[PDB]
Amino acid sequence: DVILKEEFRGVIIKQGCLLKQGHRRKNWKVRKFILREDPAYLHYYDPAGAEDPLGAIHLRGCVVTSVESNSNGRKSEEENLFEIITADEVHYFLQAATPKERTEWIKAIQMASRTGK
């Protein structure tokens, strides 16, 4: 009892809608990202119909990097891109509303990823 998913056993670090690279129909989607520490787990929710956590990003062992805007060939959609390289070797391409906020999220995930105990 008084025990739920380890993902949520850590308190919210930072929440805000971000652009998730997801070439299903669009290129970048607008979903709510809520962060949580302790095991380090980032969570994304759909504004249009999924406040249920579609999945958790495994920050434990993840590295973040400031993308030099590798938006080649297309229009510069990927500007304020920051990548999250999980320990699972998955590169998660995220973007913010501003260059400022993505930096804040770089810091967010990196500080949250420190809780890998």
By the 8 A CB rule, do 37 and 89 touch?
no
Q: How many domains is the chain built from?
A: 1
Q: Where residue 32 sits, what CATH number does that domain have?
A: 2.30.29.30
By the 8 A CB rule, do 44 and 32 touch?
yes
Q: Which residues contact 51 (CB under 8 A, 6 or more apart)?
A: 32, 45
By the 8 A CB rule, do 111 and 84 touch?
no
Scan for tokens 């920051």, then name that residue.
82
Amino acid at 27: N
Q: Which residues contact 63 (CB under 8 A, 6 or more apart)?
A: 84, 85, 113
Question: 97: domain range?
Answer: 1-117
Report the structure determination method. Answer: NMR
